[PDB]
């Protein structure tokens, strides 16, 4: 599976049949149909204690991993029940500034999208949580091009070291708080992972307010390779899945 014409999103259903299930992601956020729910609590992000370990090129994107052996970096509050610990964060981006995010707002596409992945500690490990309807909590953050994001530079300067599939690099003391928007206003709905296995185990929490990044930051993202080293060079660009049918589900707003 991939993002190409022969193995792209339109083909994933052949190997992963849930691809056309009932609670697939991503989706279009229709702001006029989203329902203001007064019973939603503020989100509670505790990341001062976060411990980053490494960054890796998995062949479909780049992931920053975190030590999830104790409640060091956690998410709770909002629509969530229990504590979810940060396991990884990744990005989805495009070939141009006009496309890239997975989720869309009234059909509008952002330059990229940041996903902070967290699992329900009630289930003991990540592997057990992805087998649960309330197993994960992904925090989605939209990226728009404007001014540079101080907090994202550390990530950008290390992309050179993990250009190709399988490459990984020690990546300690990275603070995720540097990637948060000012506001925590969000939209929330029940969905799935956006890449196979597309498990319908996620509580999506998409932040209203986008972060700005400079043109040159995003540019270094587009220099990543899908391919392994020593193979024909395929630029890692447009690694995002098209919006799926809402199908009955309803999107709630904390605002």
From Swiss-Prot:
Q: Which Gene3D superfamilies match?
A: Alpha carbonic anhydrase
* Keyword Acetylation found: yes
Describe what happens upon changing residue 63 to H. Answer: Enhanced proton transfer
**Changing residue 88 to P does what?**
In OPTB3; in Czechoslovakia
- Annotated phenotype, changing residue 195 to H: Higher affinity for bicarbonate. Enhanced proton transfer capacity
Keywords from UniProt, A to Z, are: Acetylation, Cell membrane, Cytoplasm, Disease variant, Lyase, Membrane, Metal-binding, Osteopetrosis, Phosphoprotein, Zinc
What cofactors are annotated for this protein?
A: Zn(2+); Co(2+)
Where found in the cell?
Cytoplasm; Cell membrane
Q: What is the effect of changing residue 194 to S/V?
A: Reduced activity
Q: Kindly report the pH dependence of this protein's activity.
A: Optimum pH is 6-8.
| Mutagenesis / variant outcome for changing residue 140 to R | In OPTB3; complete loss of activity
Belongs to which family? Belongs to the alpha-carbonic anhydrase family.
In the record, what disease is this protein associated with? Osteopetrosis, autosomal recessive 3: A rare genetic disease characterized by abnormally dense bone, due to defective resorption of immature bone. Osteopetrosis occurs in two forms: a severe autosomal recessive form occurring in utero, infancy, or childhood, and a benign autosomal dominant form occurring in adolescence or adulthood. Recessive osteopetrosis commonly manifests in early infancy with macrocephaly, feeding difficulties, evolving blindness and deafness, bone marrow failure, severe anemia, and hepatosplenomegaly.
What binding partners and quaternary form does the record give?
Interacts with SLC4A4. Interaction with SLC4A7 regulates SLC4A7 transporter activity. Interacts with SLC26A6 isoform 4 (via C-terminus cytoplasmic domain).
Write the protein's name. Carbonic anhydrase 2
Q: Which organism is it from?
A: Homo sapiens (Human)
């Amino acid at each position: 599976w991939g993002y190409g014409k022969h193995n792209g999103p339109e083909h994933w259903h052949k190997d992963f049949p849930i691809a056309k299930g009932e609670r697939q992601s991503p989706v279009d956020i229709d702001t006029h149909t989203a329902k203001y729910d007064p019973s939603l609590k503020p989100l509670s992000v505790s990341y001062d204690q976060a411990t980053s370990l490494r960054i890796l090129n998995n062949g479909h994107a780049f992931n920053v991993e975190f030590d999830d052996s104790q409640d060091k970096a956690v998410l709770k509050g909002g629509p969530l029940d229990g504590t979810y610990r940060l396991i990884q964060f990744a990005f989805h981006w495009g070939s141009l500034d006009g496309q890239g995010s997975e989720h869309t707002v009234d059909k509008k596409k952002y330059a990229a999208e940041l996903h902070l992945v967290h699992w329900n500690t009630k289930y003991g490990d990540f592997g057990k949580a992805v087998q649960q309807p309330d197993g994960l909590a992904v925090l989605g953050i939209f990226l728009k091009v404007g001014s540079a994001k101080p907090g994202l530079q550390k990530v950008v300067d290390v992309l050179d070291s993990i250009k190709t599939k399988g490459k990984s690099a020690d990546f300690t003391n990275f603070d995720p708080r540097g990637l948060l928007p000012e506001s925590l206003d969000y939209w929330t709905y029940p969905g799935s992972l956006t890449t196979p296995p597309l498990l319908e185990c996620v509580t999506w929490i998409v932040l209203k307010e986008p972060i700005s990044v400079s043109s040159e930051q995003v540019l270094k993202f587009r220099k990543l390779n899908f391919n392994g080293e020593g193979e024909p060079e395929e630029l890692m660009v447009d690694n995002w899945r098209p919006a799926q049918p809402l199908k009955n589900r309803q999107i709630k707003a904390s605002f």
